[PDB]
Amino acid sequence: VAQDCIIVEEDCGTTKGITLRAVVEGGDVLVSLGSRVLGRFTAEDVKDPGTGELVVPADTYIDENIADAIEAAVVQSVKVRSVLTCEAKIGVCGACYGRDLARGTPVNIGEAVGVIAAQSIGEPGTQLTTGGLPRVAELFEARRPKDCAVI
Amino acid sequence: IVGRLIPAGTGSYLRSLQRVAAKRDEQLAQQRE
Amino acid sequence: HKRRLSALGPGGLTRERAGFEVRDVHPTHYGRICPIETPEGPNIGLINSLATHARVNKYGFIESPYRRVKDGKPQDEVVYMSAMEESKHVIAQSNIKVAEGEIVEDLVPGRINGEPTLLQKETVDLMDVSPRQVVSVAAALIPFLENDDANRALMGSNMQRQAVPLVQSDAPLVGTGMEAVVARDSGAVVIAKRTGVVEQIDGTRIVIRATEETDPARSGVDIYRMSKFQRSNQSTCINQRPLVKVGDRIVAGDIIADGPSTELGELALGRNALVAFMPWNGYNFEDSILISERIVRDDVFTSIHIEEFEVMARDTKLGPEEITRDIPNVGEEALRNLDEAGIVAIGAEVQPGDILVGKVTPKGESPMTPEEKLLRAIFGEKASDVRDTSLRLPPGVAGTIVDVRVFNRHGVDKDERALAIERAEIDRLGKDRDDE
Amino acid sequence: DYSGRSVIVVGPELKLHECGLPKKMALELFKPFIYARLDAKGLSGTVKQSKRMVEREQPQVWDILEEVIREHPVLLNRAPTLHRLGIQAFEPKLIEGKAIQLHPLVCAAFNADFDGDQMAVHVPLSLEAQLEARVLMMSTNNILSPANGRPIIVPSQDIVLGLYYLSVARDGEPGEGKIFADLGEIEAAMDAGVVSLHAKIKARHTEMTPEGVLLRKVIDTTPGRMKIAALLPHHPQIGHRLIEKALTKKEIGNLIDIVYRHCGQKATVIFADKVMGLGFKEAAKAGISFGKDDIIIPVRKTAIVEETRKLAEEYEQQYITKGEKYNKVVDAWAKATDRVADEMM
Amino acid sequence: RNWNELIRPEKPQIETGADATRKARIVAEPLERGFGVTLGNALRRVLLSSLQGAAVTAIQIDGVVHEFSSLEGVREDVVDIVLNIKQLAVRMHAEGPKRMTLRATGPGPVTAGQIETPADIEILNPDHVLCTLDDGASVRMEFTVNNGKGYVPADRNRPEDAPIGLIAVDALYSPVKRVAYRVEPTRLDYDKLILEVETNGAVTPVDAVAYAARILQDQLQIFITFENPALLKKVDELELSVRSANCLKNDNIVYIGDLIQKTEAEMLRTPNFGRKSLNEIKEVLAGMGLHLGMDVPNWPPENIEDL
Amino acid sequence: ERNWNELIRPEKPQIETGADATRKARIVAEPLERGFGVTLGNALRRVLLSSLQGAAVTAIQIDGVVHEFSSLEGVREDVVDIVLNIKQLAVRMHAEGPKRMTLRATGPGPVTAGQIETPADIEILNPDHVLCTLDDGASVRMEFTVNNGKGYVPADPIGLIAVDALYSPVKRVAYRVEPTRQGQSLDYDKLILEVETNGAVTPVDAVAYAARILQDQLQIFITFE
Amino acid sequence: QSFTGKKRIRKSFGRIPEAVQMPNLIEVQRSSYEQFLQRETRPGLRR
């Protein structure tokens, strides 16, 4: 299903993005906001809560320095560009995927993203389990889970 | 399945080079009529 | 392999149709099916074997022995209780204090029906016959059991029946005691049939006297010929060695000569050496093992194998094939260690990619390239009309030859091929006849 | 075609980008390359004649095989290729035996133990495919996992254990309080036995925190510490301050990430190669042997189990049977199971 | 550095145990306190690595054809005897292979001492048993003694050059079996080295340590610095011309030396001496690397130069 | 009998790949017998780090408490720093006996080893290791008591110091084994150990002295005429 | 115990009775095939 996703364009010029928030269970956080937002290009210039200072530009690569700078000063969710909000031509641009996971530098043009994503999703399998491997298989297929009240 | 270069990475760069070469050849042929 | 209970075949659930319930273990398998010997492959939970004391009734159900116990005083009349009939009864586990006439604990652990619950000493009718009743013969050999994980012990059972018989093996220092029974029970060692003494052991055949109390007008003496080095079903050596000396009167029903991978009757699988658990410069980093040259210098872990290659001489439409001594365009050095008939002599060292049997088949006329024809005309040689189809050894260790057997048709038998072989065979037959 | 299969073994002497290859497999895979070398070298004539030289296995063909196998990378992959890291190229090196040698750190990426697993070997024929696998599929380049930014060259079992044994510091040890200027003096003292392996010691060490030159301020750490810290490259944000931890597996995994993030890739691979030998050398010197006295049972368990058995008896005489059987097992045995656990801990 | 330290005194105390040169130990009280683990380990690692011995390397009897056959009088197979003949320590004190004969028969215990050999191979272990015959036919066994070191496989020396009917067998050349090692500080702290070398009758225990020390010294000494064929070819192997071959055959020449020696005297004195061919023949001779003379007159005139 | 001459022996043990300076060095013993490459290397490493004639300092200066003072008059670092710096000082005493040494200077300049007047005829090979750039302070007139000794020694009137110096001329060694063969036998080990002496004796001379010491101490065999 | 344990004595641990002995492990196939092929007289072979 993801064999056709290949980075063909460098920049798309899209200004839209998706809000990213950290996960929290009660009074503790499971994943830090810096680790979740790291590796993606910022969609819009994030403003420091309280103090009127621009810590990050509008569209810039979120490096480790910017990462722990955003993590130090408390900040809410920041709009970040993603592959789902891209509106480019056939394929995917390098301005929405973000930093590559195999290498520290950004992703290069022509690299297959769908195949590596499918391989990374299938790698942690065989060690799972109301959730687990059948739950993930049902969620990816988007079938009817059970009779639930319509919104 | 057909046994051609995959359009990813090296294949994509080679296809881009072939496209730019075809464009240059067309530009050269336009002036020669 | 004979005590195996498969679930597939003509009338069984297919491996893809098994599911999850068939592979699961049921609490009624206590003492009827050992839940420790099972292949860890895809067909898990379908190739389970029986226990050591389990039997089969005339109907087809599995039976288990249960020592009947009365009120307090346990009886001495063991009776086999079926699976369906044992449901309406109480079972008491073994290892109970039997110092007095009855169990004094009054809280012996027993399973009424499936689940085990602490029951009283009242109306206890059945008692466990022995602790080594729910384990198979393969898992019973594992010493110091009940101290490792259940899943890890399953792998040790599969590795038990996978060791090639080594030359000059010994019994284990720490054995479970079941090795002697499994060795004497299986058909791998010879056993004396009478009480008569032995006369002489010629290595390849042992002679025994009639008996000390033999019947009148019975057989003179019992001759036992021990099988020598012969290819087994899995391409491994199988030989028997005598253990008796001159005299040494033996009682009937006693092992005389050990079989393959057996010494002094006790079962053996391999030699044992001193072990020291410790990391040695990362050579044993992962699940590996490091050994010294002393284990190879003494030749304790060396084994023997047999390939038993074969070749045919089927005729063809364009003429009949033949076992020619000399194949065309072959080097003279490669023809060494080859008899005139075309078969390598017995005991001849052969290397990988050697001509074992020289066979040439008639080849039809085929067109050739003009350059090859020009070269042939330049050198003057004449192209042969036969093709080289002689048997050649595949890549391997290229061991020595042991025995060669040739079969001829009814039309011609020992006419001009293998005549010396037939002569030697008839001479050996006459020699053994005269000796007997 | 142009492929082979054989069992794998572990080799500590091999580098990270080098893998052992048997002479039997290499002689068959590189047959046309050997033919071309014999044709160009001039030691043979006709192609048919050359095919005859390698068949008889003349001793002169071994020199041509070692020359042709110099930089030609071969592809190695396990059977269950789950992720892209399963296929990684290496540089073949001739070695005796029939087992394909391997690196202890690279085995973690393949996700395959050395019990009975076997790996296949491939050979790229084209010049472009050969040069493409050296800079795109080499094992040195695949040091980060594609799923997440976590290094996959972390020590698995032995190197981490040796580093943890070296990082531990005990206050009671001989030769404590002395000052050592250079690590050579520490090694000489350890050879004489005046100083223990790990003990409170103040030595001189350079950090280079301002990105310039440091005066080598004295630091108080055990001889086990600052011995592996010397392998750390010279760069700000890293130094002897990071080795103060106990060197846990998670800690050592995080250490390889910062060294690769700050410095280049060559420093990371060279540090991973240097730390592997030190861990194996230290683990083979200590008594890591597991014995029967190593595992001990808590003495309080014999009383806890009897108290729980006595407490569970009253619940049975009282009894609804479902509720009693459910409440008696999740409260008495559940609490007792955790009590003995913390007691033994 | 050189006779400055407290060197141990000569004549070490040799514990002449009751084993007949098979179990002895050596001691040294002032022997270089601190070198107890260096010198001792260096002497032990070399004492088990390289030591010239002797052992059988080729078995061949009449009643066998391969290593998996079976005799008629012996109690065990032929391959079982191969596992016992290899464990037979013997010393030859001489270079070159030998041949030990073994012909006997009786109650069945065939001791190793009953091996008729020349006065150069002193067999050891006279109580060792090779095979057991039940008063059957005799056995003829011829052995072969050599001298190696450490270990040698059976497929390195046996099937090198041997006819059909030679039971191959590997041999181990190691006179010593086990070696001990200990260090105890004497009363002025000095370590006392105590090692009890174990060996068979091939070499005495006191001699093995001396040989190991000599080998170690010889190894450490490396660090210290000073502190024309063209004449063999026939004359008709170049096919210059028909008349040239004719005159060469008429002259009865087989080698090019006789033709290269005669420049112009013997050339023009022949019937049909080609004026234009005499120059081409000289040119083709010079091109091959040879010229007029430049060698002894008919040096390889015999058949010894034929290839 | 001739058993110590049949095995292979390296005839060219003069591969000095290390030419950085007169201190570093790297020898090669590639054509060696299997097994000897480890034992010889271990013996050389254990002997080079053992009793060898050298020279120590084991002295401090006046107007300073033992491991308690921090600075007298504008000193650069603590007294332990000067002690560590003076401990790593090359020196070769020709005569015998615990001779004396003195050092004095002035002006805000870096202190030098040479400025140390050697009355006992014991010169300093590397007079540039000591780094003292004190300014406007009379931190001079120090006293040193050089004493001959072999091998490492532990830390053993008012004003003395219990500092243990390295009498061995070498500083650190590390051997290695790498079999290099093609067709005969892939077992011939190789010895590629190196030396990092201070400068009092070249590494080749140190290896020769170690070999001679081993040969002299291995005299526990029969004379054999 | 006769000609087998005399040459090599093997000490045994544990305290368990040895009243009943396990039958032959190959009795299953033999007993199953014997019921098929009677190999008896003419009046026999009833099953």
Place this chain on the structure above:
Amino acid sequence: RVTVEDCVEKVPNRFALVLLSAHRARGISAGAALMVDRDNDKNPVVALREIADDVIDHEGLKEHLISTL
């Protein structure tokens, strides 16, 4: 014997470097290698080593090679 760190630093594409090194090796197969010595190296490794100290914008010849038929 040379890492791809400097090569990736010179050309951050990591894909055009392969084609450039292949063309450089095809050119060095006959009458080339006047910039960097062999040093006991093969064609691809020597090309990768020379790319670190050579002009990266040399794809003009590669494009002109397949420009016409």
Place this chain on the structure above:
Amino acid sequence: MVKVFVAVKRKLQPGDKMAGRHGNKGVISRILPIEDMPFLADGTHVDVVLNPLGVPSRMNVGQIFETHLGWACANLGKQITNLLEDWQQGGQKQALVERLTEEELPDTEEGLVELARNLGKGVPIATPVFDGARMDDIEGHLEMAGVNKSGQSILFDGLTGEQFKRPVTVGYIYMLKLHHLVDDKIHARSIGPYSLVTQQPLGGKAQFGGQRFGEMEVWALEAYGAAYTLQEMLTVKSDDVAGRTKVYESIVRGDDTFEAGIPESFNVLVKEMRSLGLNVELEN
């Protein structure tokens, strides 16, 4: 017809699969000389060096108790065989033999000397499956054997000549030689017989098999940027029959280059689809 019964005498080589009595397994690593092994006291040296990290991971402990009992019985056998070496048929030796064994041991016949010859290699110990020796029993056995009660013994290092600063565990463990040999497992092919209808290299180690490039293996190359390695590995190596010899000729000549036009599998598939009513025609 003719049959040749060729026999081979294999030895233990590196890469062989050797597993213990329990679930522990592992391929045999590089074999070391006798001197490099750890030098135990009294001159003896170990023969195998297993990794002790498999105990916490795999919950099996019987191997440790088995090793301890093996060490105990080996020490007992060594102490009993030395007693008979002094004088055969000694009265004191029979007393010790009867004391160590739990009594049908003494025999009036002369066979007591033959029993000692077998007991010298270690006294056999028979432990039931569920009635095995408890901790106190094995402790008393180790104490009577002469070994330290802890079970571990001091062991030196033969490679360096130094003693480890920690007690180590040593004993006799039963080892097996599995059938998974390395000589029968290794295999390499360069050019062999191809298939009949597909025109591809055959599979299996029987007659020059080729390692199958599975479907999951193709995804690995697609993940990387490699496009020429996967293009030639699927067309010019096995698929293309016309251009299959061109690459071999180029390799033997010395020029690295290849050309792939179309695989044979695609042509077979097109011929198959044309057999049905579907019309699969190529364009351009």
Place this chain on the structure above:
Amino acid sequence: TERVIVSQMHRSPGVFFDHDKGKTHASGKLLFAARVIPYRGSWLDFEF
């Protein structure tokens, strides 16, 4: 080559009363199916 025959294990040719545990139904309930599976013949069922 000698070949042994392993024993087979299959369902007994008797009547059974197996009811699904609330599966393959629109609402939670039990079927209580009964089988008359013979040794050699057509099978019978009486599912609710």
Place this chain on the structure above:
Amino acid sequence: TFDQIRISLASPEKIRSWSFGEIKKPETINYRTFKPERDGLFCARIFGPTKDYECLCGKYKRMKYKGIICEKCGVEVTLARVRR
């Protein structure tokens, strides 16, 4: 080269154009001599010759010409690849 693969229904005219001859007899090969049949499934006249550059009946087995057709036999001389 080829691009834009298209698949659709095949008409009877296209099927007749693809085919070379019509098979009428279900005879694979002869039992006495293993050779193709006149109208069987394995026919040389319809699916080209079996041997390379060698027609049947031993008339044009010289392999020098490839455009000739044997009159008595009825099959042209062509490589074995044309049979596929």
